[PDB]
Amino acid sequence: PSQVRQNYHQDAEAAINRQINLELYASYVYLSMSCYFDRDDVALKNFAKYFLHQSHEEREHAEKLMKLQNQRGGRIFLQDIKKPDRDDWESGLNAMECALHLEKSVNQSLLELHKLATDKNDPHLCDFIETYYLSEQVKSIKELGDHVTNLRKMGAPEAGMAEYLFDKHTLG
């Protein structure tokens, strides 16, 4: 046992490692979307910038979970970061819907992690999750939902000017 470990269940450690992997995977998916929108035949610079920012924020979230794991004396065990489920995201609207789904799944994983921390009576872990990940996830999901709503109302993807003007105005 780590000299610093206290009130840190093994299941919480495993859940934190899994969450680390999931945040790294979300960072990778956002990197994939940024790459897709930097394509010459997509060429939506602000979509690419937005998703690159999301990828960097996901990487920061994973690093914060790593710091938490070390703080509590748990041991980080890294897994393979699976490739994103696709390379062609096919539109700004589809990319935003997939990002919304990804943020909802990351939020569900964080909610399950908070439930586990609550069951194991790990108040520091619960507080960490709710302070640094749950509110961030709710804000991110709301922002992604707003983006999806606006893109759909604009007529995306069929309305060709829709994604371009959303890129300039909302994301630019």
Please report whether residue 38 would count as binding a second copy according to CB under 8 A.
yes
Please report whether residue 87 would count as binding a second copy according to CB under 8 A.
yes
Is residue 58 annotated as involved in ligand binding? yes
Q: Which of the residues 113 through 172 are near a second copy (CB under 8 A)? A: 114-115, 118, 121, 123-124, 126-131, 134-135, 137-139, 141-142, 144-150, 152-155, 159-166, 168-170, 172
**CB nearer Zn ion, residue 70 or residue 108:** 108
CA distance 30 to 18: 18
Q: Is 159 exposed, middle or buried (0-12, 13-18, 19+ CB in 10 A)?
A: middle
**CA atoms within a 13 Å half-sphere pointing along the CA-CB vector of 16:** 27
Residue 61 interacting entry, from a second copy, Zn ion, none, C-beta within 5 to 8 Å by type: Zn ion
CA distance 53 to 37: 13
Please report whether residue 15 would count as binding a second copy according to CB under 8 A.
no
Is residue 61 annotated as involved in ligand binding? yes
Contacts of 121 (CB under 8 A, 6+ apart): 7
CA distance 37 to 163: 11
Among 14, 53, 70, 90, indicate the residue that binds a second copy (CB under 8 A). Answer: 70
Please report whether residue 61 would count as binding Zn ion according to CB under 5 A.
yes
CA distance 50 to 139: 15
Site of interaction with Zn ion (CB under 5 A): 23, 61
Binding residues for Fe cation: 23, 58, 61, 103, 137
